[model samples]
Target: CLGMDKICSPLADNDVTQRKTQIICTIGPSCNNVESLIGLIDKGMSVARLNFSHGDHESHFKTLQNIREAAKARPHSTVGIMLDTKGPEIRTGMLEGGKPIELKAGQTLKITTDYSMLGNSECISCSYSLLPKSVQIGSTVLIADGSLSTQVLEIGDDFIVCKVLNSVTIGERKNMNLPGCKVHLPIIGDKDRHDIVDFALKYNLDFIALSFVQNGADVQLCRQIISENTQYSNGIPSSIKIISKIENLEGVINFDSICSESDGIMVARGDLGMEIPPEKIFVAQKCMISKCNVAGKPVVTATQMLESMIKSNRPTRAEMTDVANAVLDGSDCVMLSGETANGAFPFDAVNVMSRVCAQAETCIDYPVLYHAIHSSVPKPVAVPEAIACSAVESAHDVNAKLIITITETGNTARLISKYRPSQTIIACTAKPEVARGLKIARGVKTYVLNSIHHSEVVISNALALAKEESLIESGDFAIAVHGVKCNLMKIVRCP
Candidate 1:
């Protein structure tokens, strides 16, 4: 209590309205164990992303089990497990028992499609069969994730000769990218096929993230593969989300097409920043976030989000700002790669990210974004989507306390999440994994109702549960949204 001369205000906290954004942490050696995983979840990790690029199947399965066990420790909070596939990519072959090859500037080298020969300081073989046709004589080639550079000097049917632009040491299976170059390859790889079939399908992953997605066709191909193979994939639901990782120039140009098809999008900034000019990263991120926001798809701002935290307990001021800005920009989730995967301060990173997101959400103006960045790309002509938009508008207009959305397939709830309304969204679904899957969406609180019933009965059950939990009180107004082809909505008031 303050004296008459002083001024004081009581702080009112609302958990429902607070902390809308989600945090995704990659599971690696450092935090894959049950103890650390549970610690991270307690701190605020909503999703566990397993990078298929590293780690063997046995280890990944163990981590998945740990995640499930840890999530059970916390009631009503199911942490999603995402498998990130290593898409069709070019990599340098062996270098004499996996040794690094040192090269000097202006040195001559050959990149051949033949994998039988051993890689050395002078020559390296690439996985891509058509590298010779994909690049021109003057085109710049970046190797080892753009650490080494070269200019194509000559191109042959079987190999490409190049003059090294920098002195660097590169090891086996290091990545190579050709800027201003396009190569034809299937979106999914052989290794990824096994990962999806053997592990993802068997264990029933929440999300299958595709790396290096170029366009909508890549997303379509993954969908096709899932539909064809996962017919009896037990533990998996039909609503398993597919996340497309935009990591290169092609994805940036064909952003809308990719966003429209994929269930969610990840701004894979490590390679994206390397693939494009450093000056354009901010703009590129903003554009991706805006597109995903308008499309009502969950967009994740990922990679290098908290780099310094990998070794340090705290983050740089700039890192904090980057996270806050992503939340302010309307990204549904911010992902941590090395920070939570292999960082020294894994739990701290999640806590810090959660704090930053919570702070950013308090001041972010959702209406400005709802008005400015409406999608021009045609969406599915569905009555559910139509009613979802209008319900959100009404909820915002009347300052409703809550939005109770009952979706059989979780379609309408996702659409409402995209609008970024002032009211909190509670998605009621009878589908087994729909509630757990909707955990990635911002401002969405999910409830699983075992009984599938009529639209009105569904809404009533959801309302009854909300009241039992003390989420809605007397004198509060709510917007009830439900149905698919024939959508229905009602303005409700609590007695």
Candidate 2:
């Protein structure tokens, strides 16, 4: 009886106002405390990202503890913790007195490999000792993430001299980028290994965001490292999801394989913008998002999404559109970097992002999106895929208010999420980790069940919980899906 008009009608109660696209807030000086973290969670922060590029182990551990306390404060919501590894990156060494250095146009600056030397206007230390060999005369070198440009004029045994192309003030430890040049560095360096084994594993984090992932092999190597460490340590959970950050030219070129290997993908537009043409960044973003959508993997759009919100209470029109467009482009999650990390308006940024996502979600034509994803799947799909597809289609047909997925590994719920159903999905699982990890997927709310085994009791308990949460009401229609081999489906009316 349901037609296009009926399907397009706005949702009734809870589902209508729910924000499907999750928000990942980076924990930093501004919002690392328990009260601030709780405020972020209330403002729609689904995940707390710990950027390892800047913090030490002890500080990050304290932040993690604060996050746990916040999660306990809000017992109804689940917040996933992500550890972002500082993957093979090059940076300038510290300056004397930790001050900014001003370089005038045409000034000759010596970039040395001596880590002990303090950087000044005349000379600066580079963390990568092989920088001299990696660049030649006339090569363009970008510092401070492409803000300041320079060209190499001479190469010495231990250093390279560059002529500044523009007058700019730069601080110490700023990132350096070499456009169109391939710097041979290990994918996982010593610091990354230490962070993964000592911090991420020890803390039992839910996700590890591997930075600068060039290919699937890099992801495999990270998995191998986790496997080796988790084998002996009972404290570590081997089920930690790996989210690969595509931030380089090689990563963009080999995205399909990378997306296939990693559990999820983050379109890290910061370094990626420096690596490629800034104008063409949107093209790459749309392409990667589309590929991940087709592949049925969760994708996060990150970096400078709300740049102006860092200081201002209100975001610019373009930034608002940027967040909306990311949601429209099918991103499962949107990330806030400096907007929440060191921003003065962290709460406002999260609140604005949440509101923008909710508004943009209404603009999506669910039937069209669902059909596009559905037709992409090959005919004679696997049993699990078929069940998921059928559940979504039937939900739409019956005008079901909710789709309850009884899952163990969260795969079934993710599979159904790929179809982009208009109704909210409630995923019931036995494992707490699985429940927390499901927060990354769009339109999924998890319920942890007491029973480890899936049976009639589990399904009934899940339905009762949904009723208690007011997700379903008497006379409302809902679909319940469980079991892969049996491929069961029941359309029930709430009594």
Candidate 3:
């Protein structure tokens, strides 16, 4: 429905056909301008992710404003903005001339937490304070996403002696990992706190993606901050959702708890690949996505989905298969980071992802997957959740063209999306922000209501909208999921 009017080209409109799985592309200098952002939306970019680790407040503020403006131009589309936070990740400190230091395999090095010591070629400093307690003798320490590896020889109160296992160059603030170590790092850091107010609260971002989330407690900590801020802030809406980015080994180990606490999950394979064995990433992806489906939440698979597209006009066959496999693995969304952010072909990258998703959906056993995910899902206690589930089932039975859901907070829509229904979903919400956030969910088409209406009235309104847009026709079957009505489910013969 989004690109119906704004036709860029025959290929853009044809190849970028309707897709069941959603697409999220990170916004950067390459695609932040209004013209390119609008083009992306027209090419099926439902969510625009803004990484907080890279840009300043001024630049991000402009990007946020630009996205809204772009959305207005495409009146049928709702593009959600996700703010990815910099979590409690360990990093290397400054180096001389801002140049990287080469570490030889046979060299002996020391990692110190003491601020007094200036890191040089022979030694380095870590951001984490309890490194000595977190690691043990013979533990593997990987820096810069496993580019530089070391073996811990000794641990002291403030320093760690290690023997380099590989030769690689290390720079300032590079990622450091102790894959299986029980490092007690807070989910939210000082920078995150300041940005929550300055960026998230101020811009009213649709999603706050917590990076390096280890477990449920970390998710809860971020939720607490959002709750506190909502109570204090006068204008901020409470509809902002939390997306936990599982990028560490501990996160993979505690996937269930993490997915249970957060509203959604992002299988961040960039760091996750470095933290865990490369052979395990695909399996971990399938496992995490299944877990999230069982929990009735959206799961996104991200990182290097189309890495080659960053430089080449066309993606490698392996990258294409990687994305297709993620779709078949039951990922609700597939994300693009550098491929669309700073890549040479931002528009082409989105087009390729869309085509791949549509093709994969054709090959997948969607009906079987829909039932598998639904049957394994926990029973619903709330009437709204129960009604949503029944609506999808009834829609499938009647061969409904689509499922119409009227929600105030997008909760009912999310519940329906988790089931992976065979029919397309049209989520109608009274709040625009809620409608926008629903864009992240699979097969959900969002629309903002002009005014609040009762359950029956909402169904009638939705039918008119759908018919007007040619989404349905007379004699076609459609299911309506709404509240404030008995049974809260209606099977209609489209008018």
lDDT for residue 393 in candidate 2, whole number 0-100: 91
- Runs of candidate 3 exceeding 4 Å displacement: 1-16, 94-100, 231-237, 378-382
lDDT per residue (tens digit) for residues 386-471 in model 2: 88978899999999988988888999999989999888888888888898788789999888877637566766776787788877
Candidate 2 regions exceeding 4 Å error are 1-17, 93-125, 132-139, 152-163, 169-173, 231-237, 452-454, 484-486
TM-scores, each model vs. reference: 0.90, 0.90, 0.92
Clashing pairs in 2: none
For each candidate in the order shown, give its overall lDDT on alpha carbons.
0.82, 0.88, 0.83
| 117-176: candidate 1 lDDT, tens digit per residue | 898888899999999988998988899878899999999999999999998889988888
Which prediction has the highest TM-score against the true structure? 3
Candidate number with the higher TM-score (2 or 3): 3
- Looking at candidate 3, the ten consecutive residues that score lowest on lDDT are 6-15
Candidate 2 worst ten-residue window by lDDT: 7-16
Per model, how many backbone clashes are there? 0, 0, 0
